[PDB]
Amino acid sequence: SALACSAHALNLIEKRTLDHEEMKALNREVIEYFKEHVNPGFLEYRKSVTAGGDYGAVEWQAGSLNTLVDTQGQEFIDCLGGFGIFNVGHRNPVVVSAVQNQLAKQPLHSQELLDPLRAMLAKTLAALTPGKLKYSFFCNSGTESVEAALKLAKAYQSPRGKFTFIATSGAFHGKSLGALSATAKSTFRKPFMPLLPGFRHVPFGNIEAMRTALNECKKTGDDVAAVILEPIQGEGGVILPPPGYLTAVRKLCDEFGALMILDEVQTGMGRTGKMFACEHENVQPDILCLAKALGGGVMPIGATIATEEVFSVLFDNPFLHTTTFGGNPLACAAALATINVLLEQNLPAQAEQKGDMLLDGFRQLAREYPDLVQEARGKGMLMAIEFVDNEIGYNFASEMFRQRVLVAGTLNNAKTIRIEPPLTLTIEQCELVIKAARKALAAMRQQVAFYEILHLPNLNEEQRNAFIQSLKDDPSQSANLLAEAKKLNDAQA
Amino acid sequence: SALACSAHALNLIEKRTLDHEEMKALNREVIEYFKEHVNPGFLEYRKSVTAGGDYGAVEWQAGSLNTLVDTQGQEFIDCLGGFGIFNVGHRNPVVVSAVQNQLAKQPLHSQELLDPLRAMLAKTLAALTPGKLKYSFFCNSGTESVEAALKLAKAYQSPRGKFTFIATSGAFHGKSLGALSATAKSTFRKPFMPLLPGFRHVPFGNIEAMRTALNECKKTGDDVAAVILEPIQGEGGVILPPPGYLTAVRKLCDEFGALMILDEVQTGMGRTGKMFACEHENVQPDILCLAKALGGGVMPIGATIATEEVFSVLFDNPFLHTTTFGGNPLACAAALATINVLLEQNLPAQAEQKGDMLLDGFRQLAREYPDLVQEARGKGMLMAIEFVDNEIGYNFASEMFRQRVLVAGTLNNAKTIRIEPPLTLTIEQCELVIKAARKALAAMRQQVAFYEILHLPNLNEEQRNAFIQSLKDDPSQSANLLAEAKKLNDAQA
Amino acid sequence: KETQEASWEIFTLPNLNGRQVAAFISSLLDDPSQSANLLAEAKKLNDVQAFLAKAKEDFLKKWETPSQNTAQLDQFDRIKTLGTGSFGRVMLVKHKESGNHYAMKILDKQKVVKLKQIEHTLNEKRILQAVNFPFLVKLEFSFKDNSNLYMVMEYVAGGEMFSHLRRIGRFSEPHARFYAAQIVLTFEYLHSLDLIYRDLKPENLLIDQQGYIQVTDFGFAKRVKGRTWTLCGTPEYLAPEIILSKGYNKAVDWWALGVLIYEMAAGYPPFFADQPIQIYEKIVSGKVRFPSHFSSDLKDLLRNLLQVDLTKRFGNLKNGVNDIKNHKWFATTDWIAIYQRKVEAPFIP
């Protein structure tokens, strides 16, 4: 019965530790259900099952601020941070109690009485945001964030006869039909077409291009309502735009009277060094999208902050754009807690020193294995290593998973991996990571070399065997023996 | 500073009671901020400020399961239930601890490791849902619910060459651009047009119409992908469709190979008498949208449950439709708690007896004041009273607000008011409500009559004064004195 | 519409009856210009009556179970002996804990019993103990011992109105308006608590350090619900009903006000003869011809208050007190400001 299934899951919430067969039990239901009620695919493409072991790595509870412990007790260092969620770490004590307090009083609002925390957050965000960004709208996610932004721009610009929206190729903005009209990857968009009419993509980091789009549209009577872009393409592979770009986009917008929308969903809340990435070039957008880390990894939340000139649209009919759960008290709680922590222990500043020590650490590794890595890149605690193959990439992401270091990448989309550990990552865990990636890079180089030695056609078995022998006895020579085998295979060529 | 504003709001979370000037202080910031950072409009159109009093009615904390207490200590009976959110009441002790437990372990997931509660919920929902509905997708709201539904239908039906979507006039489904393409009110849609191409509306409760839409589209090569409707139009004014309709829609769909999407966002989780409204006619949709009350008024959540045949689309590329926060552990917690409570204290069954005692109670009041009410209507604990004017309606919703009974309606959209108290409303509070609405209906009838006596043109001041005199001395004669004044005004006519 | 808003506001006043509101609605209907003034007055009236509600509740509480021995003799230090009566003597005292000054009245138990004054004494105390109004003397403390009763009264320097009226001779109508207005509000208050005062005369009117009035004798005042018959008072101020020996009520106070005003503006009472029996004759067939310098408005009010027809007497109509508060002679008086004591006194002793 559903009554049955509810209770069994209800008692498991209460349980805090597990007998080894209580574990086995669990992991087998959880795989069983994932296959029959969730998606069977996540069992196919995820690194938690491929490299799971005998059992998958089913989540259990948070370890420290930076660690995660599965149902077997294995503790993982999070260098994923839920793709930019866990900026203040897992269960940050300051956020968890702000939530638990608010939970004692009133978790959600009535929707009729002026709820106080939504004012306080709207206020704080006004304070925290650059230039004339004043009004906040509150939703539940990063996609609802962008949607409302699109709606604001729309309601603003359509009376002025402007309907077209420029977005950028490689841009991600959300999976809901409205945001998916601005999101750019082929794969994500094609099945659900036709999407919103009038969304046109230009290359990212290309101001010369965006002028031509804004101008062509002008000429043909399809004038641009708004331009929407991320400060850094996060999912897009940690693409950094050319210095001056965001500033130059900002003028270009101002020149053509087009609203500028900044999707700071993955670069907001101090990840890139500054509280908002658009502060590195000190650029003020007309609209700013926030989410993910705004909810301190405790709560889900999305905020849309805009200038007064733009948010005015909603003033005369405030019900034009509502949401049911948006701005609920205990989500509010969470953010104010997160906003407080970020300014107190001043973690944007931490983001920049840990963010360069790490990244440098990776582009060093990247010089030492140019045969497995094209490049590493990032800005503050948002960074990514680009491998040569998805084969290799998924092999890196997977290898370290076993070294109990949790990074990105799935079975297929894995050519470039992303490193996004909490901003609260210690200097001790910082090395432990670059160390783990060095071991990982060694072992892969071993395997890569290993095959290389085998299809050497001119090389005979007698010689090949000598190399394979010294390879296993000395994996350090994986590069030397290789060169010696290739040099030998060419000798008999 | 933002650091400053964060802390002040942070300490207020900690505070549990307020000195009367600590109150005054609060309510004035909260109004001040709402005007300068949230919306000034909500101060114009909401009943919390118009009828606020000297101060507005700023929320503070939950009272009992059915009561809410503002910053002045005034306790309100919730006959709104957050528009169908608070189905198991405010802070239902069983939900709050399931949440607080899960909060001690891990609030959000890593997105790499198989999270156990999302299996358990996916499982339970499979159990709880009629027919072949098997797979659940998890999002954050009611709008994200429908969006994914639209996306499932799309990804299913577009390979089969079907792109058009029929929705119904009066339908509400969400404010995000995708759902807003199916949502039907003019007001909500117009500013943001052009929306998704290929959405066509037909009248609700009209099977004769929907045949013609499905057939016309067939003829013209624009074959219907899916039909989407609510079992009852909730926001649409508690519109009940003709018996047999939902069943007859279900065949019509099956006949034209069109997917049937049921928006049980506001009629789900036991409000109408059954766990899902589509069980009264025992109809199984291809897709089912859930939200609101699924989160036990503690958490925000949305679920999209579908048949295997349909959810298969996502199997081969499970990342086609993801969301960042969807299915997070502590939202999961909340639902399983809510699902458990609803089956335990068997509250759908409570919904039907309280839902008829109330509603009958209103259509009685409705016979006694036919000059202020056209009709009352509902199905289980979803019900609404329809007045004659928005003037009158906002006057009812507002009047009772002061009688500390919290109902729907805003300053303008208020012709029909909705009654949606928690399913945990006691029989004692049940009368207290019908009583409060009787007082309210009296006082309005007084005022209505009062003006009626004044523009009686043939009536002189001397006579008019006698009526006004007895009116104030005996408001019960408001009907009698009126008839006597009108009869007198006609005597001098 | 703009008018209709003020109309509803007038009707929403809980303190106002059907008659009162219907009176503010009419004037509005007829004068949409004074909308704000009509709604204003309505609010004053509402508020005004509302307070009377808090005054009565507060009175009864004290009237029902009265205070006793709120002080003791060795809490004060005798400064001087101010005056002596038949009851005993009045002394100026200093409260040792505060340094405040009072006029303590000592009255010999045995001397009262002889003078057959047991009731008056008890009734005066019980009234004073329960009463609270700016223009009334305030009994601060009250106690007794073996030998005598003690009434500790707020000391106010300034003579009787009687002797003061002799000095000036007659008051200018603005001077008399200032004194009348206070007696009016006092009477409104007392009538509310169903109390006839029954002893209004210049001798019972002391003057504040602030030049305002203090009313000073309560031996006669009665908590009367319906009607009473005991005649007590000074011949000049008796309403015809008292004399005539048919029951009377609170109307009698309003008559006396009339007489009191007449005297303050004329320098002599309207019904006056060498010997009393005669003063009664002149009262009963109530022909009161005014002095020449008497304002016609002041004449109109006096013709109204001094009215043998107690169904035609200002004070006891349906608007009750409001009739003379709204009279042409009292247009230039701010009652609430009179109440606050924020009005410039015409004379300070």
Author numbering:
A (entry chain A), B (entry chain A): 9 to 501
C (entry chain B): 107 to 455
From the reporting publication:
Here, we propose a method for generating proteins and protein complexes with complicated shapes using fusions of alpha helices. To design amino acid sequences that can stabilize the alpha helical structure of the fusion sites, we superimposed one or two turns of terminal alpha helices of connecting proteins using a molecular graphics program. Then, the amino acid residues important for forming a fused helical structure were chosen from the two natural sequences in the superimposed region. Our method does not require complicated computer calculations for the design process and can be used for the assembly of artificial protein complexes with predictable and rigid structures.
To demonstrate that target proteins other than calmodulin can be attached to the YgjG backbone with a rigid and predictable structure, we merged the C-terminal helix of ZpA963 to the N-terminal helix of the catalytic domain of PKA (PKA_C) by the shared helix method. The fusion helix was designed by superimposing the last three amino acids of the C-terminal helix of ZpA963 with the first turn of the N-terminal helix of PKA_C using a molecular graphics program. The resulting fusion protein could be produced in E. coli and readily crystallized. Binding analysis using gel-filtration chromatography revealed that the fusion proteins formed a stable complex, as intended. The crystal structure demonstrates that the two helices are successfully fused and become a single extended helix without altering the structure of the PKA catalytic domain. Using the calmodulin and PKA domains as model proteins, we demonstrate that the shared helix strategy can be used to increase the effective size of proteins and to enforce four-fold symmetry.
